[PDB]
Amino acid sequence: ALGIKSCDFQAARNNEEHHTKALSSRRLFVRRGQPFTIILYFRAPVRAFLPALKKVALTAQTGEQPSKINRTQATFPISSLGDRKWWSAVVEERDAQSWTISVTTPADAVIGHYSLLLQVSGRKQLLLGQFTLLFNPWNREDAVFLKNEAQRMEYLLNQNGLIYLGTADCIQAESWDFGQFEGDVIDLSLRLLSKDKQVEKWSQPVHVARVLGALLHFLKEQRVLPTLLNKRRGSVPILRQWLTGRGRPVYDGQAWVLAAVACTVLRCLGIPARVVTTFASAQGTGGRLLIDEYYNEEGLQNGEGQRGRIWIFQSTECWMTRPALPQGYDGWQILHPSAGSCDLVPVRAVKEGTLGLTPAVSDLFAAINASCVVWKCCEDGTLELTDSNTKYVGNNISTKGVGSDRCEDITQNYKYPEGSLQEKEVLERVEKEKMERESPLYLLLKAPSSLPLRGDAQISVTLVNHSEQEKAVQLAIGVQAVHYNGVLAAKLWRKKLHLTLSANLEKIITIGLFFSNFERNPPENTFLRLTAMATHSESNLSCFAQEDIAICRPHLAIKMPEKAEQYQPLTASVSLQNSLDAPMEDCVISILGRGLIHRERSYRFRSVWPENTMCAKFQFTPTHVGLQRLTVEVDCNMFQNLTNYKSVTVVAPELSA
């Protein structure tokens, strides 16, 4: 007299209440520690409510071997005296034939796929349906709790990311589709997590982020190939290709996508995450605070590079409490893969040099605090020290701002101001702990931050003679192409000036930096390493200076209305001026964007001669309400993968009859 006809999980309503509406309207995705409502339908009318209520019990199971000691299986009754903090069910509305039941999960429940099962006394267990349980940044008792709604929207719900690339002095923001609410990302993430066998620890955000980071780094090492190859469409195709092997592989010039992929997996699981870019990052030192750079007599590097390099840019940051640490380390944690295992490092441990809190504090501290030493490499084979400009590491630590497409500088979270008292104290304490455990010429190099592609720049070299006697200096200037990770790509240009410097005189030399004078075109994704080396007389000391120059491509201007009505046609015009020296040939323009365009559309447009302007218009109809983003990519024979973006807020239609 108590048979069960069906069970409505009400996935649409619950997913909207549990901030999983972008995932699905059919499957139930709920966040732990928050009630969700199901409707239970009886085949026959229920005569007496209270005895029937006493007859029914609910069981929640996750995993292949669910048990109560693993906290993977919980049995609870349907009554108003259930523990709302724990697994509990209560009837909130009822009819003769249907019970509306509020079901609560504990704030520290194990995440993953769950089966909800109903037991009637003296009857077999019945499966009511499935649901997936995620971390809850909205729940104050949850370890991933975020104070601000804006921060929850940015670090969990926002699928349109910005990854900052380029150099410190020319930061190029790349539109990136995290796609954490793409339909299969949650399943892929949980299947990747199932490689770890300590499912009782899947309630802990620290353990999940540490496991996923080690697994994703292992997949990056297994799948990223040596070197369009550089055409990217966000984290989701990369994750699919890493887990399955099917799809376009990523090549080593874009190995920085690991941070974005990790951000996507964590955000999909419910852990707030952000992608952070650090410019001039000292990698591969093993905690050592010295970087050795080697240059030949022409201000150029002969080899591929040392193991310890200063990368032009290089991270995933995740938000959670740190219960197993001393107090005060809640908040932002850096996932750091070690070749392997993954350590979660609190950012303040890096800022305050708390080397010994976690095993990876030393390496993360060295990446943004090392000093570069430059050695001249002679034809004799001598390796000689150089008076060198200071090459600062850890510059312009950037991540996407909250609630806009702007760039937020977070460097002050990782480091005290240079030359300040606190930085002095931290560096002295770190150096002391490490120790216990174990000339007349001046060169000033002025360069532009960026060089227009197929364009011209002017560089300045200031030589000041401090001697009482005039000097015969040899000024070697070299331009070389470097990959983002400091790997030498191609020698481009070299000059050898011979100057006479008057005693006690400042001399300024201006040099034209021209693309057309380069011996070969810089490879794609590379940066210009400009060097100046001054040798005088027989002092054996060479003044040296270096700068990283970005390559600036033509600006892809997108003109679109700020507001747009859903289901009404919208026009976006795109303009691109050919500032290059050659016509743009084989020209393809692509448009995409979640909630604006299904997948993407590629178009061909006519060749654009130098000093001409392309102007393409596109009509499309937005179909999804909210803050959407249109991404436009332009390819030609002169350049490829030139992307820009623009945001449009899509409003619902005006209510009428």
DSSP letter string, 123-150: S--EEEEEEEEE--TT-TTSTT--S-HH
Distant-in-sequence contacts of 584-588, Cβ < 8 A, 24+ apart = 584/608, 584/614, 584/636, 584/637, 584/638, 585/636, 585/637, 585/638, 586/635, 586/636, 586/637, 587/614, 587/634, 587/635, 587/636, 588/634, 588/635, 588/636
DSSP string for residues in 534-586: EEETT---EEEEEEEEEEEPPPEEEE--SEEETTS-EEEEEEEE--SSS-B-S
CA dihedral 651, 652, 656, 657 (to 10 degrees): 160
Report the residue numbers after which the chain has a gap, meaning the C atom sits over 2.5 angstroms from the next written residue's N, or none. Answer: 227, 314, 339, 438
Cited resolution, angstroms = 2.5
The approach used to solve this structure was cryo-EM
Q: Return all residues near 291 (Cβ < 8 A) that are at least 6 apart.
A: 282, 285, 306, 308, 309, 310, 370, 371, 372, 373, 391, 393
Instruction: Give the residue from 188, 181, 248 showing the smallest Cα distance to 216.
Output: 188
φ, ψ of residue 585 to 5 degrees: the values are: -120, 155
Pairing status of strand 588-592 against strand 626-635: antiparallel
φ, ψ of residue 193 to 5 degrees: the values are: -65, -30
Q: Return all residues near 655 (Cβ < 8 A) that are at least 6 apart.
A: none
CATH superfamily of 556-651: Immunoglobulins (2.60.40.10)
Instruction: Give the residue from 554, 591, 587, 550 showing the smallest Cα distance to 572.
Output: 591
Cα distances (Å, whole numbers) of residue 137 to 33, 132, 195, 325, 488: 10, 16, 25, 20, 43
In 181-276 the beta strands, taken as DSSP E runs, fall at 273-275
- In this structure, the number of other CB atoms found within 10 A of the CB of residue 58 comes to 22
φ, ψ of residue 476 to 5 degrees: the values are: -100, 125
Contact predicate 569/507, CB 8 Å? no
Instruction: Give the residue from 170, 215, 160 showing the smallest Cα distance to 191.
Output: 215
- In this structure, the number of other CB atoms found within 10 A of the CB of residue 39 comes to 15
Q: Using CA atoms, how far apart are residues 126 and 73, in angstroms rounded to an integer?
A: 15
- Output the six-digit token pair for 121: 């006394």
Q: Please state the domain extents for the chain.
A: 4-134, 149-437, 438-552, 556-651
CATH 3.90.260.10 fits 149-437, yes or no: yes
Contact predicate 509/525, CB 8 Å? no
Q: Return all residues near 60 (Cβ < 8 A) that are at least 6 apart.
A: 73, 74, 76, 87, 105, 114, 115, 116, 117
Q: Using CA atoms, how far apart are residues 475 and 510, in angstroms rounded to an integer?
A: 12
The three-state secondary structure class of 192 is: helix
To 5 degrees, how large is the angle CA 288–CA 294–CA 300? 140
Contact predicate 311/280, CB 8 Å? yes
- Output the six-digit token pair for 497: 């000036």
CATH superfamily of 438-552: Immunoglobulins (2.60.40.10)
Q: Indicate left, alpha or beta for 138 from its phi (over 0: left) and psi (-120 to 50: alpha).
A: alpha
Q: Could you tell me how many residues make up the chain?
A: 657
Q: Return all residues near 496 (Cβ < 8 A) that are at least 6 apart.
A: 298, 474, 475, 476, 477
- Output the six-digit token pair for 212: 């996923």
Tokens 């008076």 -> residue: 387
φ, ψ of residue 635 to 5 degrees: the values are: -120, 145
CATH topology of domain 4-134: Immunoglobulin-like (2.60.40)
Contact predicate 91/53, CB 8 Å? yes
Q: Return all residues near 563 (Cβ < 8 A) that are at least 6 apart.
A: 648, 649, 651
Q: Do domains 4-134 and 438-552 have the same CATH topology?
A: yes
